[PDB]
Design a protein around this ligand. Structure first.
Ligand code: CDL
Ligand code: CDL
Ligand code: CDL
Ligand code: CDL
Ligand code: PEE
Ligand code: PEE
Ligand code: PEE
Ligand code: PEE
Ligand code: ZN
Lengths: 141, 100, 230, 226, 51, 98, 186, 93, 152, 122
């Protein structure tokens, strides 16, 4: 996508909130400890307890988000992604084709008809005696 | 890869809006009983009658409208001094002969 | 540990640019105005250099900040055109029955729409190459040819138009709307003349800005064509 | 971190043209006296010299192997400091959310100076109150006037300096046996022979020990045009 | 401030006096009538051109 | 899943030892990737080909010592000895012990 | 004033003693001309690609951003210690040096004008080439037009070459040069 | 020399048989007189002389031509007017 | 006429005179037509991306001649634009509160003529020339100049 | 398999082509690669708008602690004497501007006959 979005289309830094799905959960998992079981009372708080790099998952997320920036080969995206990347480009190109091979031919026919019959082929011939081509978009009359 | 708008938002809201505008307009016309038949002509009745006379051959072809009114402005008086419909028709006739 | 932001403490371009603006007002010669415009260009370019040199701070939020500024600016460009469309439609009840010759719906609209579409395709190819870390030399020169033809066609149209600005508010609105589009076309030339391949690639705000602006101008011409020609 | 921009090329490795030309003195400089570039090339030369000697690796202890590669064996003192450093850096561009602070376990507010502005939002749910901003100065156990949440300032200060990865490495790492240049030469001949250089860093390093320009092709390597 | 005001003042005063005397073409026209009177010729070649 | 799959930084190799992509303007040299794949073989095809790291056999005894001292590390070291460790396998080993 | 201004050099020894750095060129280290080097390597002269010689002078820029990195000390030419410390720099450079420095400070603006002017010259050529030509006959008499509407209004589409010739003859009559021009036959 | 990422596919260093003398900068070292740049050959700074010289010439030509046109050609509305804006030869005004 | 190839092959060969088709059907030929600096990044491209790029590029370059034809016809049309009736000066037509001088605030050329009213300016320039003041333009017949688009 | 020079032999036909065809193909290949592309390379390298923004800026030292001028010095003066000279030159134009601006006020004041306030009624 063209526009940059911190959450989804973050191409400036390449940050990703979660690790790749390819990695086993034992190797790397999304940072989610909402399901942690209640802490036993005899356990004592050693660390700060503050959300941050003391948590293993968050640490691995930061580490991977920096070490993923160098890779031996490309991670080929599927054709669906590639189509979306240039959706506007392809659509504009087809619009140009339509303007040349659809709009072009009937516009030429209308002008040639206008030459002989004074008004385009999609207009009501007048009887008022006024001269000239008149309107072109008949449905906006 | 996360989407913010409708998957087909551009076509959806463009063609969709046009459709709603067109349909709403038809409904509005029905409620007010507006005549929906397009007329491309002027409605000056006396003028349209003069035009029929030209089409019927009662008034000579290429006769100007100011050659038929009962009041002429100054600029049309200037034109009437140099108007020769008979000569104009002969010139057109000569052109047709040359073309064919 | 470093500070989150590398504060800029002093700047002198602002004084110069503001004085340059005053010269436009306090002058007795139109030649002075021409040379003053060059001074403006120079100093605006210095400000752009300051933006490029701010890259040394390695601040992630800089791209986002500039991108959103462009969004606001584009919005202001769209709303200025809206004001002209408003001026045009307010007097719509006095159009089409006056003794003036309005524009044809066959020649100008088609060649212009076909031309501007090709301009979009070129910019799109530039974006595609930008994505692929590639460059094609001929692309920019195709833009120059397109701009040349656009300028050639608009000049002839104005010179061969038989109705003047003082003839009707219709004619004034036609000329003004077309001129406003042309000015935005010329601003596109100002931006595109510097297009080159930079190796920092997609952290360069220039590329996204050009793509957005060119699309805006072409889309704006579609609206104009429907209003005036068709 | 999310607030950092994209890795540079230097973040991975340094160009060999940044290698100090006086390698003989570089390998004899104490760690506390080595700069960032000097320390990079001391570790790379010594670390790759041991790694490119396969026959000796199995008999080398992890303590000795870590020393050769320049990796610091962790301990509670250094772990504490490094951890608080990384927590400070994370909080530069991240939110500050954690458990409710009490006398037993105050909210830890890392700072380099003697003061840091802090806001208390209270507890969770209905116990959350409007932001109450206060200046957290060192040496005082702060108590919110509204929810009685206890705060405390933690200073990253050591011997007229703040805590950095470089400071932690200098204070706790101990230089081992002085690097022997014979090992550099021995490994150099192992992987570099007959115009094949499979240890480029050791070919450049040996050239400098020889005096710069001695090894084949090195004069041509050092001749630049601009 | 006064030092740089003088050269601008002198230039504008001469310009203002000239502009009040007439347009550029009215000035060249007065010199053309004088040249036509000096020679006694009703029509003379334009400046920079021969007879 | 970032930047369209294009790595921000990647290795390129050249067959000619005196080749310079900035000074020369020849049109015959084909660059290779980090694994050595020539540029004319598309990514979609080369990424399917299986590439494994080959260390000199003199390192096998060291890689064996690592596996024994850390049994959780043994399966990865065994893959490396047997020439079955891909880049993905290396990444899994790296992040598992952080 | 200072030796540097008297003998301008790029990356010499004794820069601090010479008193100033007169060259904005930064980087180097290429092994060949036009080759891969360090630094950005930008200057008013002797850089980039030579059009006349069809050869590269300096390599592509090595940015001090993610795409690149720092410059090795062996090839640094703008020492910040000498580059900064502008105390009494005007005396070291003199008045002509001050003029030179001002001119050299606007390389960025000069680079832009070199890329911007050409297209504007082309646009101006369109205007000049048209201004020389006599104006086309935009309008004719209202009455005479409507007495020959079909010929005038539609003549162009039916036969453009004869319509062009007819227009030319009317221009020759409207501006009184008909006997001085020979209008080519159609 | 370039990026650390670009490299030769086969790592070979040439056994140069040529006997050319070593360029001085090839064997140089950092010195107190030369804290930086000791590996790069010293060069002339043409920009310092060529930029102010060229600028002066262009300004002189620009102004001199403008003065000349506006003082050596007949009075006219623009420069193009003063050059190609006279009446046809033989048209007496 | 060569008989060593089929008719289809001959047509395709001639359409490949500039190598466009060969670069489409050969990745190696496409990458070796890139300048060395950009060829370095080529190995990362997918074949989908490569051919789609060529398709967009080829469609654009193949439509430029058509736009050029359309633009030439436009120039010819404007070059021989038919005369139109002189406008009658209606109730709200040709209203002026002050002369036209915004283009020349000090010189005030053609104060009575409108900014792009070419015929009024021509006669005004003629007056200035008759007054010994040179003005540029409106002197060469259109058919005797280049790029006029008014020649038979 | 025989490998021909890039861009010189067609793959669309087994027949290489006739003399005119081969001449056109070879010479277009040469013109593009060694003549037309001289302009593009010249514009890309010698006239880069982004290289020109970093002209006169010190090199970025590999040692991280030797680049403190980034934050010690404002970006507007990264250019040393060059950037100080540009500011100083514009500074010299202050009083000339004041005289010029003051003249405009005098011009308007005179043209409005405001100097004859007393002479009008005397
Ligand atoms: C009348 C004249 C109209 C002129 C229109 C001119 C349009 C110029 C730009 C055209 C262009 O290049 O668009 C394609 C391009 C498509 O984007 P993409 O990311 O490739 O889209 C991917 C998919 O389409 C799928 O994308 P997605 O759906 O996943 O979402 C991503 C994309 C989705 O968005 C788009 O793609 C935008 C498309 C717009 C098309 C318009 C036609 O997001 C953006 O690009 C967001 C841009 C920022 C929008 C900011 C809006 C600010 C104003 C908000 C209202 C404030 C006042 C409220 C008052 C009332 C309070 C109660 O659009 C942009 O990137 C331009 C965004 C900025 C446009 C600003 C326009 C003014 C506001
Ligand atoms: C910016 C220029 C805009 C010009 C617009 C003109 C519009 C009218 C129609 C022109 C038709 C030609 C194509 C125009 C589109 C752009 C072409 C393009 O992209 O070229 C890239 C091509 C290489 O670009 P690159 O960046 O190096 O490579 C990009 C790709 O990676 C690799 O590119 P690729 O190999 O895939 O090529 C793409 C392909 C795509 O184009 C097509 O296939 C389109 C085919 C259209 C057929 C229409 C029928 O384009 C070509 O094959 C272009 C071949 C041009 C060969 C020019 C050789 C020198 C000619 C010198 C003539 C001198 C005449 C003197 C007469 C003197 C009389 C006294 O650029 C050039 O070779 C430069 C020239 C570009 C074309 C200029 C056309 C001028 C036409 C003048 C006609 C004068 C007639 C006078 C008659 C007098 C009678 C008395
Ligand atoms: C050795 C030779 C060295 C030459 C060095 C460069 C000289 C530049 C100065 C110069 O030639 O000035 C006269 C030159 C030609 O003017 P002129 O008609 O001969 O003299 C003015 C007449 O007194 C009055 O004629 P006007 O009332 O028609 O005004 C024409 C217009 C003269 O300027 C233009 O006409 C502008 C030229 C670019 C037009 C671009 C139009 C783009 C499309 C816009 C919309 C349609 C416009 C349709 C018209 O006046 C001011 O702009 O234009 C200028 O005054 C400045 C041109 C350079 C900027
Ligand atoms: C072997 C080979 C030999 C080869 C030989 C030949 C080689 C080639 C020769 C080519 C010669 C060409 C000559 C003509 C050049 C074009 C002149 C021109 O266009 O101007 C007239 C032309 C048409 O007007 P005109 O009817 O000819 O002019 C009437 C005269 O000005 C009548 O004067 P006026 O009374 O109307 O003047 C009033 C005065 C206004 O007077 C005042 O305001 C000053 C009064 C006090 C004077 C004493 C000083 C007191 C203190 C003043 C303090 C001022 C500063 C204060 C702060 C700022 C306040 C604003 O305004 C001016 O003087 C205007 C110019 C101001 C200076 C501009 C910078 C120089 O004007 C324009 O179209 C404007 C310029 C457009 C073209 C230039 C664009 C520049 C763009 C930047 C890049 C340029 C690159 C150039 C490269 C060139 C390489 C060669
Ligand atoms: C057994 C089943 C057989 C079916 C056969 C189907 C045959 C269908 C044939 C369709 C032919 C259509 C021809 C259209 C020609 C248009 C020519 C034209 O107008 O050219 C000029 C015009 C521009 O004119 P201007 O002067 O600029 O004026 C307009 C703008 N101001 O140019 C264009 O429009 C350019 C585009 C031309 C498109 C031509 C389309 C041809 C289509 C052929 C289709 C053949 C299909 C065959 C199917 C066979 C199935 C067995
Ligand atoms: C499918 C696409 C559809 C797009 C529809 C866009 C709708 C936007 C409407 C915004 C404004 C709506 C206001 C309510 C409708 C009133 C219309 C109306 O009365 O118009 C005429 C009346 C003027 O007439 P009077 O003042 O009475 O006398 C004039 C005598 N000379 O109002 C106007 O001037 C209308 C001005 C607004 C038109 C432009 C609106 C904004 C256009 C945005 C374009 C993007
Ligand atoms: C107009 C002012 C727009 C200000 C907001 C947008 C600014 C912007 O994005 O400019 C930068 C952007 C790219 O710079 P980067 O180094 O990639 O980004 C800067 C650091 N991240 O620069 C440009 O857009 C290039 C501008 C070149 C043309 C300038 C023409 C000025 C014309 C002035 C006429 C009066
Ligand atoms: C920046 C914009 C620069 C625009 C320069 C061109 C201005 C221009 O062409 O204005 C004329 C154009 C058409 O008017 P007429 O000449 O009467 O039309 C008769 C057609 N034969 O419109 C105007 O006169 C309005 C000009 C407004 C000021 C433009 C400059 C700001
Ligand atoms: Zn509280």
């Amino acid at each position: 996508k063209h526009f940059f979005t911190d959450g989804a289309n973050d191409y400036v830094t390449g940050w990703e909130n979660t690790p790749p799905l390819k990695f086993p959960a034992s190797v790397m998992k999304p940072c989610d400890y909402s399901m942690t079981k209640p802490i036993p009372k005899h356990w004592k708080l050693r660390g700060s307890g503050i959300h941050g790099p003391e948590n293993t998952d968050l640490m691995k997320l930061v580490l991977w988000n920096r070490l993923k920036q160098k890779r031996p080969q490309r991670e080929v995206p599927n054709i669906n992604y590639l189509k979306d990347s240039i959706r506007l480009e392809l659509s504009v190109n087809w619009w140009l084709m339509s303007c040349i091979f659809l709009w072009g031919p009937w516009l030429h026919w209308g002008q040639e008809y206008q030459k002989v019959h004074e008004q385009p082929p999609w207009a009501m011939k007048r009887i008022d005696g006024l001269r000239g081509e008149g309107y072109f978009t008949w449905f906006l009359e | 890869g996360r989407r913010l708008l409708h998957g087909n938002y551009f076509t959806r809201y463009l063609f969709g809006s046009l459709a709603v505008i067109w349909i709403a307009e038809y409904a509005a016309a029905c409620q007010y009983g507006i005549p929906r038949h397009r007329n491309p002509n002027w409605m000056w009745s006396w003028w349209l009658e003069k035009q029929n006379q030209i089409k019927n051959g009662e008034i000579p072809a290429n006769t100007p409208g100011y050659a038929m009114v009962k009041w002429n402005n100054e600029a049309e008086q200037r034109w009437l001094k140099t108007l020769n419909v008979e000569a104009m028709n002969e010139e057109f006739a000569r052109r047709r002969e040359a073309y064919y | 540990f470093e500070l989150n932001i590398n504060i800029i403490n002093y700047n002198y371009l602002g004084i110069i640019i503001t004085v340059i603006i005053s010269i436009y007002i306090y002058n007795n010669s139109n030649i002075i105005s021409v040379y003053n415009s060059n001074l403006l260009l120079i100093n605006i370019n210095i400000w752009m250099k300051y933006n490029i040199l701010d890259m040394l701070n390695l601040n992630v939020l800089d791209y986002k900040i500039l991108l959103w500024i462009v969004v606001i600016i584009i919005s202001n460009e769209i709303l200025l055109f809206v004001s002209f469309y408003w001026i045009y439609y307010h007097n719509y009840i006095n159009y089409y029955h006056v003794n003036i010759l309005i524009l044809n719906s066959y020649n100008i609209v088609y060649n212009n729409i076909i031309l501007l579409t090709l301009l979009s395709t070129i910019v799109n190819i530039k974006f595609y190459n930008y994505i692929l870390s590639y460059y094609k030399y001929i692309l920019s020169y195709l833009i120059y040819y397109n701009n040349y033809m656009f300028n050639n066609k608009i000049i002839l149209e104005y010179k061969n138009n038989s109705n003047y600005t003082n003839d009707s508010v219709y004619m004034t609105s036609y000329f003004y709307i077309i001129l406003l589009h042309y000015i935005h076309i010329y601003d596109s030339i100002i931006l595109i003349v510097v297009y080159n391949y930079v190796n920092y690639k997609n952290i360069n705000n220039y590329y996204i800005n050009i793509n957005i602006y060119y699309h805006l101008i072409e889309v704006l011409y579609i609206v104009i064509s429907i209003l005036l020609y068709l | 971190y999310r607030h950092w921009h994209r890795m540079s090329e230097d973040d991975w490795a340094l160009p060999l043209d940044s290698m100090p030309e006086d390698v003989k003195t570089l390998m004899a400089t104490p760690q506390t006296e080595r700069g960032f570039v000097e320390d990079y090339w001391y570790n790379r030369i010594r670390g790759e010299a041991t790694l490119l000697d396969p026959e000796a690796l199995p008999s080398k202890s992890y303590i000795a192997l870590a020393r050769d590669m320049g990796l610091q064996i962790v301990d509670e003192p250094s772990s504490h400091m490094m951890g608080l450093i990384e927590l400070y850096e994370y909080l530069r561009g991240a939110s500050f959310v954690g458990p409710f602070g009490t006398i037993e376990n105050p909210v830890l507010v890392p700072a380099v100076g003697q003061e840091r502005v802090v806001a208390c939002t209270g507890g969770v749910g209905d116990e959350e109150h409007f932001t109450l901003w206060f200046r957290c100065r060192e040496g005082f156990m702060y108590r919110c006037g509204e929810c009685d949440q206890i705060f405390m300032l933690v200073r990253l200060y050591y011997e007229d300096r703040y805590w950095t990865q470089t400071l932690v490495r200098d204070t706790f790492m101990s230089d081992g046996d002085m690097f022997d240049l014979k090992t550099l030469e021995r490994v150099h001949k192992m992987w570099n022979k007959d115009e094949m250089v499979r240890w480029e860093v050791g070919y450049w390093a040996q050239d400098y020990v020889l005096g710069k320009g001695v090894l084949p092709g090195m004069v041509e390597e050092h001749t630049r045009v601009n | 401030t006064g030092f740089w005001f003088i050269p601008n003042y002198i230039w504008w005063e001469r310009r203002y006096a000239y502009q009040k005397a007439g347009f550029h073409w009215e000035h060249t026209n007065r010199k053309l009538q004088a040249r036509k009177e000096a020679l006694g010729m009703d029509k003379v070649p334009a400046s920079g051109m021969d007879w | 899943a970032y930047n369209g799959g294009y790595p921000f930084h990647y290795v390129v190799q050249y067959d000619d030892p005196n080749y310079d992509c900035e000074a020369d303007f020849e049109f015959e040299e084909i660059p290779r990737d980090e694994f050595g794949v020539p540029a004319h073989i598309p990514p979609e095809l080369s990424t399917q080909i299986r590439h494994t790291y080959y260390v000199p056999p003199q390192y096998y005894p060291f890689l064996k010592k690592l596996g024994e001292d850390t049994p959780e590390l043994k399966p990865y070291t065994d893959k490396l000895i047997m020439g079955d460790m891909t880049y993905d396998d290396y990444e899994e080993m790296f992040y598992k012990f952080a | 004033g200072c030796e540097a201004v008297k003998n301008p050099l790029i990356g010499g020894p004794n820069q601090k003693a010479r008193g100033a750095i007169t060259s904005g060129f930064a980087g180097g280290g290429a092994k060949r001309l036009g080759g891969k080097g360090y630094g950005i390597m930008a200057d008013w002269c002797d850089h980039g690609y030579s059009f006349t010689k069809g050869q590269a002078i300096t390599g592509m820029p090595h940015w001090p951003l993610w795409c690149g990195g720092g410059v090795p000390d062996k090839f640094i030419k703008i020492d910040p210690d000498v580059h900064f410390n502008l105390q009494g720099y005007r005396e070291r450079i003199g008045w002509y040096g001050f003029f030179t420095a001002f001119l050299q400070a606007n390389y960025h603006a000069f680079v832009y004008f070199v890329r911007f002017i050409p297209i504007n010259i082309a646009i101006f050529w369109i205007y000049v080439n048209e201004r020389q030509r006599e104006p086309q006959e935009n309008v004719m008499d209202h009455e005479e037009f409507f007495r020959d509407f079909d010929s005038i209004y539609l003549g162009q589409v039916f036969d453009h070459h004869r319509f062009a010739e007819w227009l030319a003859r009317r221009r020759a009559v409207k501006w009184g040069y008909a006997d001085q021009i020979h209008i080519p036959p159609v | 020399r370039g990026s650390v990422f670009q490299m030769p596919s086969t790592p070979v260093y040439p056994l140069t048989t040529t006997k050319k003398v070593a360029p001085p900068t090839a064997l140089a070292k950092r010195t107190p007189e030369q804290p930086f740049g000791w590996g790069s050959p010293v060069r002339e700074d043409r920009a310092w002389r060529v930029v102010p010289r060229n600028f002066i010439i262009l300004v002189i030509v620009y102004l001199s031509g403008w003065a000349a046109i506006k003082t050596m050609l007949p009075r006219g509305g623009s420069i193009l007017g003063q050059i190609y804006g006279g009446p046809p030869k033989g048209r007496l005004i | 006429i060569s008989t060593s190839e089929t008719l289809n092959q001959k047509i395709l060969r001639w359409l490949d005179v500039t190598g466009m088709l060969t670069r489409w059907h050969s990745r190696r030929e496409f990458i070796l037509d890139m300048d060395p600096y950009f060829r370095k990044n080529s190995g990362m491209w997918t074949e989908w991306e490569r051919k789609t790029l060529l398709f967009l590029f080829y469609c654009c370059t193949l439509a430029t001649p058509y736009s050029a034809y359309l633009d030439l016809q436009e120039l010819k049309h404007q070059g021989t634009k038919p005369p139109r009736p002189v406008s009658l000066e209606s109730r709200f037509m040709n209203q002026r509160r002050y002369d036209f001088t915004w283009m020349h605030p000090q010189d005030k050329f053609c104060s009575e003529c409108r900014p792009v009213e070419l015929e009024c300016k021509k006669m005004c320039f003629d007056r200035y020339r008759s007054m010994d003041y040179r003005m540029y333009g409106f002197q060469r017949p259109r058919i005797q100049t280049y790029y006029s688009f008014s020649t038979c | 398999v025989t490998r021909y020079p890039s861009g010189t032999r067609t793959i669309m036909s087994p027949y290489p082509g006739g003399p005119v065809y081969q001449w056109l193909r070879i010479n277009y290949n040469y013109f593009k690669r060694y003549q037309w592309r001289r302009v593009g390379r010249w514009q890309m390298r010698s006239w880069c708008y982004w290289k020109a923004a970093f002209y006169g800026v010190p090199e970025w030292n590999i040692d991280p602690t030797k680049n403190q001028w980034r934050w010690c010095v404002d970006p507007a003066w990264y250019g040393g004497m060059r950037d100080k000279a540009n500011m100083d030159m514009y500074r010299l134009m202050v009083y000339p501007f004041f005289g010029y601006a003051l003249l405009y006020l005098h011009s308007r004041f005179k043209q409005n006959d405001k100097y004859n306030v007393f002479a009008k009624w005397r």
